[PDB]
Amino acid sequence: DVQALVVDNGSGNVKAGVAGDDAPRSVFPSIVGRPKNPGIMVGMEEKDAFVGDEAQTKRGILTLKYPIEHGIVTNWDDMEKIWHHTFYNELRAAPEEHPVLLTEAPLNPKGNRERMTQIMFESFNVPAMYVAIQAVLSLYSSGRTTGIVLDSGDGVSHTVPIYEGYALPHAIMRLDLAGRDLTEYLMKILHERGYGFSTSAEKEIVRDIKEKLCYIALNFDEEMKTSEQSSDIEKSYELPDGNIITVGNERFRCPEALFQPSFLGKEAAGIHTTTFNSIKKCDVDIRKDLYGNIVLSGGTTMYEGIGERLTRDITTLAPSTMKIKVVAPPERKYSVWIGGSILSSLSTFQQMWITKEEYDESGPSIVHRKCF
Amino acid sequence: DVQALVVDNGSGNVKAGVAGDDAPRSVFPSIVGRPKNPGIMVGMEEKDAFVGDEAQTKRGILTLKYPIEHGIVTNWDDMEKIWHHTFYNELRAAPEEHPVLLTEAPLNPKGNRERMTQIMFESFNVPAMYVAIQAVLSLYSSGRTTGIVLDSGDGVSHTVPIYEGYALPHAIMRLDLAGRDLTEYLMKILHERGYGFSTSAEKEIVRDIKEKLCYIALNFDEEMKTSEQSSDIEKSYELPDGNIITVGNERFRCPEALFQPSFLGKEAAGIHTTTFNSIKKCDVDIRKDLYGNIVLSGGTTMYEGIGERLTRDITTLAPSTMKIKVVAPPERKYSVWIGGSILSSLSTFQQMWITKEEYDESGPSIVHRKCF
Amino acid sequence: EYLMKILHERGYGFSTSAEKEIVRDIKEKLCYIALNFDEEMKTSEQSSDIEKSYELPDGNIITVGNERFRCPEALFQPSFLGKEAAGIHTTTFNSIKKCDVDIRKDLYGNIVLSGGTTMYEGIGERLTRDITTLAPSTMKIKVVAPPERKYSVWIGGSILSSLSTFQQMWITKEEYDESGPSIVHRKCF
Amino acid sequence: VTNEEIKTASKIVRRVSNVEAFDKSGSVFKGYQIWTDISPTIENDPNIMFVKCVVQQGSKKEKLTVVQIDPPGTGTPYDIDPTHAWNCNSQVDPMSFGDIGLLNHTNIPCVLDFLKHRYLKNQIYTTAVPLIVAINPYKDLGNTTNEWIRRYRDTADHTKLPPHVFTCAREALSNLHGVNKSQTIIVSGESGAGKTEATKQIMRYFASSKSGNMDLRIQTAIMAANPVLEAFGNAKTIRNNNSSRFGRFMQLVISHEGGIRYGSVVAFLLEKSRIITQDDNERSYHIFYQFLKGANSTMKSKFGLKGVTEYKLLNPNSTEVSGVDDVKDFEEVIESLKNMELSESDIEVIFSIVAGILTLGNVRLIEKQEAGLSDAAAIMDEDMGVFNKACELMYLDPELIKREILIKVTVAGGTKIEGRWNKNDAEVLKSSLCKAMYEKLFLWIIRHLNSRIEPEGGFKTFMGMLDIFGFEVFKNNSLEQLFINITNEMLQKNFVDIVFERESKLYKDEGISTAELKYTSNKEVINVLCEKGKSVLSYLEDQCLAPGGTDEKFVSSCATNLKENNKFTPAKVASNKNFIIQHTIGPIQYCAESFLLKNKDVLRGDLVEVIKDSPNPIVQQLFEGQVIEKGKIAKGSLIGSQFLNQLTSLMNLINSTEPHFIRCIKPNENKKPLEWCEPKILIQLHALSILEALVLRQLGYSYRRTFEEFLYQYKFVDIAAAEDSSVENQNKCVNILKLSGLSESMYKIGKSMVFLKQEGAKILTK
Ligand SMILES: C/C1=C\[C@H](C)C[C@H](C)OC(=O)C[C@H](c2ccc(O)cc2)NC(=O)[C@@H](Cc2c(Br)[nH]c3ccccc23)N(C)C(=O)[C@H](C)NC(=O)[C@@H](C)C1
Ligand SMILES: C/C1=C\[C@H](C)C[C@H](C)OC(=O)C[C@H](c2ccc(O)cc2)NC(=O)[C@@H](Cc2c(Br)[nH]c3ccccc23)N(C)C(=O)[C@H](C)NC(=O)[C@@H](C)C1
Ligand SMILES: C/C1=C\[C@H](C)C[C@H](C)OC(=O)C[C@H](c2ccc(O)cc2)NC(=O)[C@@H](Cc2c(Br)[nH]c3ccccc23)N(C)C(=O)[C@H](C)NC(=O)[C@@H](C)C1
Ligand SMILES: Nc1ncnc2c1ncn2[C@@H]1O[C@H](COP(=O)(O)OP(=O)(O)O)[C@@H](O)[C@H]1O
Ligand SMILES: Nc1ncnc2c1ncn2[C@@H]1O[C@H](COP(=O)(O)OP(=O)(O)O)[C@@H](O)[C@H]1O
Ligand SMILES: [Mg+2]
Ligand SMILES: [Mg+2]
């Protein structure tokens, strides 16, 4: 028997593996770098595009670009490069022997998955293919059939409610505000201390600062007030070349823009209001079982103290007799991939692939019939 | 198979040899002398221009001139004389049978290498030619692909950083302060003891004094202070005709003008600041690998105690957690030539020569396309 | 600094701090902006009417060619001087595209140049032609380059400070004495 | 057997000629036999790859319904595809001739079954002119009797005799004594396919003349060294236990009508990289293990030896092999050394040298921050004693060896400058010293043996017996296999040239035009592999010289530059470490891992001079004759350049003489006689380029027959011009041809024979 390949490619990292395991085999960032200087020594690799983890060790020489933004692919040649590197160099398994389970976000344009299908069936020659939705696999991986999933990664933040296996497509909500916007907002508000990060290879240093030092405050105004009385809020960080920088308020002002998008000039609602407005579009009978299973997912939900803030902020909006219960598993950064592997390793699922004959006789539009 | 000829001609000496060896065959000064007195005995050589090592044994009769100053050729007839003497009398190998690898300094005018090419292809008839840069060959000869080269010879002092084979042309720095200025400064400050050297043939005696007796002090002010308490600083030197001179402070005040050019009336920065200002023009990610490979080269870097002073002076400018590492090989006087031979004896390089057909169809400007 | 660097290719070496002023004066006197960079670089190798002469303080004569339109071109292609950034024509368009779709038509109509580095000959035409290529086809790009745009900031400051509504926005001395130097973060935008 | 051989053999199989027997315009069959690969016995017997099926009368054109008969596994008809059906040979007998290029249908199962049939009746020799195939029967066929030698020598007719090694022997003796031209026998096969037996039989045939004897002191002297040779020049691989890692050559000078006057032994292409590092599942040369285990107490106390698992040059995870005892062979090699006139002092010296090699292989080097360098080399204090020992057992001066390993002296225009090596270069120099000492000791032993049977008039016209190996067609390939494949490409070029010349001569003798015989050449792959400037080896050297070179850069530079021609191709999976070369026998894949570490070898003139001034005479004789050259960079001393030089010398030596070819094959692995394993035999048919020779015959007219056999075979096709009994054979044959309907582009009528294309004979059958 042959196993399937599970490839969950978001706007940031790429998670890839074989169906059956309980963790992705290869995780690497989805960037393509190109050299901006001329090479002068003879006998060196005259490569013209570095992909993945190699374009990250020598980022000081290259210009880095992401081919996916807001969940939508803006450059298809770079995406083909990423997929080629993923199949042949990372997994080391030709795609012409295994079926592939890809992943997309809800409320995306249709040309996206149509072109994805055309590329999978024409450039590579896969025997079968399928395109799932991330917030559903994140629930597969949890042992539940009822709950609302709040998935937040690098490009998109979306909520999807599900009641006993039935999808409620009129209550799906999408919000273009994720980790990349928080990186840019931190890079902007760091100017107030005299630190200027501008290049594309300095965005990675800011991202690492954000991952290491930022947290979420339970009460924003009280926290902003008690930080002007002392200096135990400040932390230090050492740059790659040896300098030392110090951060204060910026530790809890950067992620706060998830709950108040107007900080970064957007007219939208926070993740605590988008979640409550998505429950209130469901029938009055099923609202008590959604308040009990609020599942966090993605990587941007990994700040310290986000469950407490989310619970306290939804409890204030819901009636007084409900029991709010936020579920934050410790490995929620790979929930989509684990759910995809579980799903693709089922016997009932083996009748839902999009085989090659159907594509040959019906064209790329077939994905709109067979895939939800 | 035929080997190439490697000719590294600086402002002082000339290093020449055949590609494949590990040391230059012929090393001789690049001077042209002319007699200033009339010859009176019959049956003697009525030569009118002595070149190289011959113009140095009978310098008491001649007026000596250098055809290269600050890396730029100021007299082309004397340069043709030097090249003729190098090919036919020193190497004893006609240039019409071998390719020639010449060498130039960075940030020079373009007419220089254009005229060099025209002369090589028209006066002599070489089958192929190439023009390299000295600070790159000095790194070829070291077994590294990452580092900053501080090359200091007789006319020019320049720094060139390189990261994994990629050149960073916006961080190249040039400084017109080298051994000849130190010779003139010593010749000037020797007047304070009553020794007057004025003629062109007495500049060589001063140069020899400098090579024999001068050194670099670790701390200039402490050294200047502890030399007024005793007389163990003084040394003696015997002139060609038998007199004895004595030198004191001048032993460590002459090379100190490399770190404080204002001693000799120049408005510039020392070699320890020019090196640090050249690292600080590189991206923050690649600065830690340049602090670890600072390669000394050329002949003016051969003073006693220059590595310690350079390390102590750069450590004071860099952050506290970096590891400064100055590399001073014991044969750093011929690093450019060894690197040139290594380079010209590669199989990948044999496609980069400037053949004669390209020159015949494109003119002397071709060097600006094929040579970096 | 970029002009001082690329002048080495003709054999002129300016190094000291008092020779930077001579280079600055050369730049102010002889440089201009080309409408199409590649066509200009190509048509300058066919003749020598591009070259100009300049007399140094002590009497020497230097001649400049391509360097007349290659120095300011680094405003539109910063990679010439080793920077990873976008030109002034892309930074301007990327700043309009961060505004709401309703107010973008009134920004395309009033692009105001200011400062002294915007005084090269032919910068309005290049900027208009380069933004027109990025904007939709039905918009009306309109670059405004007043002839005294070198002192616009000062004139605006005088106009502002000579208003009656403004006299309530100064940071008086009592507020500083009672609140410290941080007061500027409240009262000044 | 394992499954990897099954996969490889299944991947070798081809498919070309289509099936038939729907003649003429219906669906009638004549009891037609085919070969197929789908059968219940195939998925059960691993030693079977094809079965002979009979198509049932009434099958359809689209799908074939067949019942197998060979072996008779069942009788129930089943269905197979027309693409899994290869033709067969039913109107032919494998014992009516020896040549194979005469069969009508030549493909994989046809030739396999042909060889199987001939072999099962103890007929092990076969001919593929001018090739001679042989098989190892694991017993004695009674062909070593002097009766056979006299039968094949004295009988003036030999060309109408069964094929035998004595055919080649007699042709060689004839061409040697007739015209003054030297001859060469090339025995190319696996190290277990019985090559030594063929060599011994050829030498015995050579020994017996009309005045010659049976045994000669040369024979017993040469066989008095095979223990030594196989102890020093053989190692345990993963697909063998006694693999020969060098080419053995023997020059024999024989009188006109006497025996064997003198002989000399020469070794070529010894693999030096094995002395330093071996794979995880192999060992080094035998002598190390057998000397370390079999040495008596006095040596283990005098030399200071330790256990096998305590040395750096020896792979610790694989030291034991079951079929080898590793003890008694030590006494065997000692006795073989005693038999060749060596005192006890010489044995003591040789084993001290080997122990010193093993000891020096254990010294460790560290880095220092001194001499203005960051990584100046230095010997670790803990081994400072060990090092001294390693210099005593070789009779060398420790201080001078330290000076030549850790110090670098550069002579400028007129001055001496004293540098210092880093750690990597110092380790390279130490390893080079070890490998050079080993190889020179081996060569000195060979010379001391040759000293007894030396000819004094020199070799002007002699006899040659080269013992070589074949391709390496598995999936885990490295630098050594690359060298082997290069050697075999050279040999293939030589073979094709010889064959084309002989066939042009033959066509010229039988009165046929020769403006139509065109053979393909393998000069493109040789240019891709070994040209100067643009080849794999040149770029490997470049990466060994350039600063900061790696294997990935080597693969990338090859992929970028050799992209002009289609003989180089990068892999698909992990394409930054593997590549593929299109050899003449098909594509082989290499893994460019640890190429640089195994290609670096630097020996300088100063060290040679230090060695030549040793007090011991044997060490003085070790490096003598070798000229030195100091003041250069290592651009001609790396392993690739040495290999190319030795290959050039050997190919010159061969191109001097006239060659003859012999191929040995082993039928199975359990050594039991009269067996068969079609995968393991198809692999060796592929490696030895036998199928390539067959494909080469099928150009031109491969079916060459005299009029007698031609009429005997085609007496039933044409009756109107066969039994006339009134005209010459050429006339009746040309009448049969003009009646058959073959165009001139399909036949030729020779002055004593008839020549037919492959398509011609495929037509004339029906
Ligand atoms: C932050 C980094 C190093 C730092 C120098 C590490 C050290 C430790 O911080 C300081 O020394 C603080 C100091 C400073 C602090 C307080 C102050 O009242 C004035 C200056 N800031 C500066 O000198 C600014 C000046 C500046 C440039 Br030009 N444009 C800017 C745009 C916005 C804001 C400020 C600036 N400066 C040189 C930088 O940002 C440079 C470009 N930054 C980097 O290369 C990054 C990759 C690493
Ligand atoms: C240095 C040399 C020899 C030396 C005579 C070797 C001996 C050993 O030194 C002395 O005797 C020191 C003595 C002296 C010392 C102390 C003092 O308070 C006064 C004089 N100095 C002198 O007599 C000066 C006077 C002088 C002339 Br005129 N113009 C000059 C320009 C600047 C400075 C001084 C002068 N003097 C004759 C020279 O320099 C001559 C031209 N120098 C040479 O030919 C060189 C090639 C070799
Ligand atoms: C430009 C100026 C005067 C000029 C002499 C005015 C005249 C009119 O131009 C020439 O004569 C061109 C000529 C020259 C032209 C073409 C050529 O193939 C070689 C030389 N150039 C030279 O001689 C260079 C040689 C040189 C020194 Br040393 N380091 C350098 C660093 C980089 C490049 C070149 C050099 N030279 C003396 C200078 O730059 C001096 C330092 N420059 C000045 O003092 C400035 C303040 C004024
Ligand atoms: N410990 C952490 N704290 C805060 N943010 C994190 C942390 N780890 C990862 N992130 C953020 O997660 C984002 C990527 O999350 P992930 O969901 O794995 O990728 P994708 O969005 O492509 O699915 C990054 O932008 C990064 O900023
Ligand atoms: N031992 C030494 N100490 C100090 N300076 C030296 C020494 N040897 C040579 N020099 C200086 O080196 C200069 C020439 O160096 P070199 O690089 O060989 O020539 P070039 O500059 O032409 O390449 C001379 O001016 C000489 O003053
Ligand atoms: Mg995701
Ligand atoms: Mg030099």
Coordinates of N, CA and C in Angstrom, one line a residue, chain A residues 12-91:
Chain A
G12 N 3.6 31.8 5.9 CA 4.9 31.8 6.5 C 5.7 30.5 6.2
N13 N 5.6 29.6 7.2 CA 6.3 28.3 7.0 C 5.6 27.4 6.1
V14 N 6.3 26.2 5.8 CA 5.7 25.1 5.1 C 5.9 23.8 5.9
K15 N 4.8 23.1 6.2 CA 4.8 21.9 6.9 C 4.6 20.8 5.9
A16 N 5.5 19.8 5.9 CA 5.3 18.7 4.9 C 5.7 17.4 5.6
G17 N 5.0 16.3 5.2 CA 5.3 15.0 5.7 C 4.5 13.9 5.0
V18 N 4.5 12.7 5.6 CA 3.8 11.6 5.0 C 2.7 11.2 5.9
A19 N 1.6 10.8 5.3 CA 0.3 10.5 6.0 C 0.5 9.3 6.9
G20 N 0.3 9.5 8.2 CA 0.5 8.4 9.1 C 1.3 8.8 10.3
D21 N 2.2 9.7 10.2 CA 2.9 10.2 11.3 C 2.1 11.1 12.2
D22 N 2.7 11.6 13.3 CA 2.0 12.4 14.3 C 2.7 13.8 14.4
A23 N 3.6 14.2 13.4 CA 4.2 15.4 13.4 C 4.9 15.6 12.0
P24 N 4.9 16.8 11.5 CA 5.5 17.0 10.2 C 7.0 16.7 10.1
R25 N 7.4 16.1 9.0 CA 8.8 15.8 8.9 C 9.7 17.0 8.7
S26 N 9.3 17.8 7.7 CA 10.1 19.0 7.3 C 9.3 20.2 7.5
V27 N 9.8 21.2 8.3 CA 9.2 22.5 8.4 C 10.2 23.5 8.1
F28 N 9.9 24.4 7.1 CA 10.9 25.4 6.7 C 10.2 26.6 6.1
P29 N 10.8 27.8 6.2 CA 10.1 29.0 5.7 C 9.9 29.0 4.2
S30 N 8.8 29.7 3.8 CA 8.5 29.7 2.4 C 9.0 31.1 1.8
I31 N 10.3 31.2 1.6 CA 10.9 32.4 1.0 C 11.7 32.0 -0.2
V32 N 11.9 32.9 -1.1 CA 12.8 32.8 -2.3 C 13.7 34.0 -2.3
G33 N 15.0 33.7 -2.2 CA 16.0 34.8 -2.2 C 16.8 34.9 -3.4
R34 N 17.2 36.1 -3.8 CA 18.1 36.3 -4.9 C 19.2 37.2 -4.6
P35 N 20.4 36.9 -5.1 CA 21.6 37.7 -4.8 C 21.6 39.0 -5.4
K36 N 22.0 40.0 -4.7 CA 22.0 41.4 -5.1 C 23.4 41.9 -5.4
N37 N 24.4 41.1 -5.2 CA 25.8 41.5 -5.4 C 26.4 40.5 -6.4
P38 N 27.5 40.9 -7.1 CA 28.2 40.0 -8.0 C 29.2 39.1 -7.3
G39 N 29.2 37.8 -7.8 CA 30.2 36.9 -7.3 C 31.5 37.0 -8.0
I40 N 32.6 36.9 -7.2 CA 33.9 37.3 -7.7 C 34.9 36.1 -7.6
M41 N 34.6 35.2 -6.7 CA 35.5 34.0 -6.6 C 35.1 32.9 -7.6
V42 N 36.1 32.3 -8.2 CA 35.8 31.2 -9.1 C 35.7 29.9 -8.4
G43 N 34.9 29.0 -8.9 CA 34.8 27.7 -8.2 C 33.6 27.7 -7.2
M44 N 32.7 28.6 -7.2 CA 31.6 28.6 -6.3 C 30.3 28.4 -7.0
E45 N 29.2 28.1 -6.3 CA 27.9 27.8 -6.9 C 27.4 29.1 -7.5
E46 N 27.2 29.1 -8.8 CA 26.5 30.2 -9.4 C 25.0 30.1 -9.5
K47 N 24.4 29.8 -8.4 CA 23.0 29.6 -8.3 C 22.3 31.0 -8.3
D48 N 21.1 31.0 -8.8 CA 20.4 32.3 -9.0 C 19.1 32.4 -8.2
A49 N 18.8 31.4 -7.4 CA 17.6 31.5 -6.5 C 17.8 30.4 -5.4
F50 N 17.8 30.9 -4.2 CA 17.9 30.0 -3.0 C 16.5 29.9 -2.3
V51 N 16.2 28.7 -1.9 CA 14.8 28.4 -1.5 C 14.9 27.8 -0.1
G52 N 14.0 28.3 0.8 CA 13.8 27.6 2.1 C 14.8 27.9 3.1
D53 N 15.4 26.9 3.7 CA 16.3 27.1 4.9 C 17.6 27.6 4.4
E54 N 18.0 27.4 3.1 CA 19.3 27.9 2.6 C 19.3 29.4 2.5
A55 N 18.2 29.9 2.0 CA 18.0 31.3 1.8 C 17.9 32.1 3.1
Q56 N 18.0 31.4 4.3 CA 17.9 32.0 5.6 C 19.3 32.1 6.3
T57 N 20.2 31.2 6.0 CA 21.5 31.2 6.6 C 22.4 32.3 5.9
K58 N 22.2 32.6 4.6 CA 22.9 33.6 3.9 C 22.0 34.7 3.4
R59 N 21.1 35.1 4.4 CA 20.2 36.2 4.0 C 20.9 37.6 3.9
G60 N 22.1 37.7 4.5 CA 22.7 39.0 4.4 C 23.1 39.4 3.0
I61 N 23.1 38.4 2.0 CA 23.5 38.7 0.7 C 22.3 38.8 -0.3
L62 N 21.1 38.3 0.1 CA 20.0 38.1 -0.8 C 18.9 39.1 -0.5
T63 N 18.0 39.2 -1.5 CA 16.7 39.8 -1.3 C 15.6 38.8 -1.2
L64 N 14.9 38.8 0.0 CA 13.9 37.7 0.3 C 12.5 38.2 -0.1
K65 N 11.8 37.2 -0.7 CA 10.4 37.5 -1.1 C 9.5 36.3 -0.7
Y66 N 8.3 36.6 -0.3 CA 7.3 35.6 0.0 C 6.3 35.5 -1.2
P67 N 6.1 34.3 -1.7 CA 5.2 34.1 -2.8 C 3.7 34.1 -2.5
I68 N 3.4 34.0 -1.2 CA 2.0 33.9 -0.7 C 1.8 35.1 0.2
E69 N 0.7 35.9 0.0 CA 0.3 37.0 0.9 C -1.2 36.9 1.1
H70 N -1.6 37.0 2.4 CA -3.0 36.9 2.8 C -3.7 35.6 2.3
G71 N -2.9 34.6 2.3 CA -3.4 33.3 1.8 C -3.6 33.1 0.3
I72 N -3.3 34.2 -0.5 CA -3.4 34.1 -1.9 C -2.1 34.2 -2.5
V73 N -1.8 33.3 -3.5 CA -0.5 33.3 -4.2 C -0.4 34.4 -5.2
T74 N 0.6 35.2 -5.1 CA 0.8 36.4 -6.0 C 1.9 36.1 -7.0
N75 N 2.6 35.0 -6.9 CA 3.7 34.7 -7.9 C 3.7 33.2 -8.0
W76 N 3.5 32.7 -9.2 CA 3.3 31.2 -9.4 C 4.6 30.5 -9.7
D77 N 5.6 31.3 -10.3 CA 6.9 30.6 -10.5 C 7.6 30.3 -9.2
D78 N 7.6 31.3 -8.3 CA 8.2 31.1 -7.0 C 7.5 29.9 -6.3
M79 N 6.2 29.8 -6.4 CA 5.4 28.8 -5.8 C 5.8 27.4 -6.4
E80 N 6.0 27.3 -7.7 CA 6.5 26.1 -8.3 C 7.9 25.8 -7.8
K81 N 8.7 26.8 -7.6 CA 10.1 26.5 -7.0 C 9.9 25.9 -5.6
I82 N 9.0 26.5 -4.8 CA 8.8 26.0 -3.4 C 8.4 24.6 -3.4
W83 N 7.4 24.3 -4.3 CA 6.9 22.9 -4.3 C 7.9 21.9 -4.8
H84 N 8.7 22.3 -5.8 CA 9.7 21.4 -6.3 C 10.7 21.1 -5.2
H85 N 11.2 22.2 -4.5 CA 12.1 22.0 -3.4 C 11.5 21.1 -2.3
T86 N 10.2 21.3 -2.0 CA 9.6 20.5 -1.0 C 9.5 19.0 -1.4
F87 N 9.1 18.7 -2.6 CA 8.9 17.3 -3.0 C 10.3 16.6 -3.1
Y88 N 11.2 17.2 -3.9 CA 12.4 16.4 -4.3 C 13.5 16.5 -3.3
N89 N 13.7 17.7 -2.7 CA 14.8 17.9 -1.8 C 14.5 17.7 -0.3
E90 N 13.3 18.0 0.1 CA 13.0 17.8 1.5 C 12.4 16.5 1.9
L91 N 11.3 16.1 1.2 CA 10.7 14.8 1.4 C 11.4 13.7 0.7

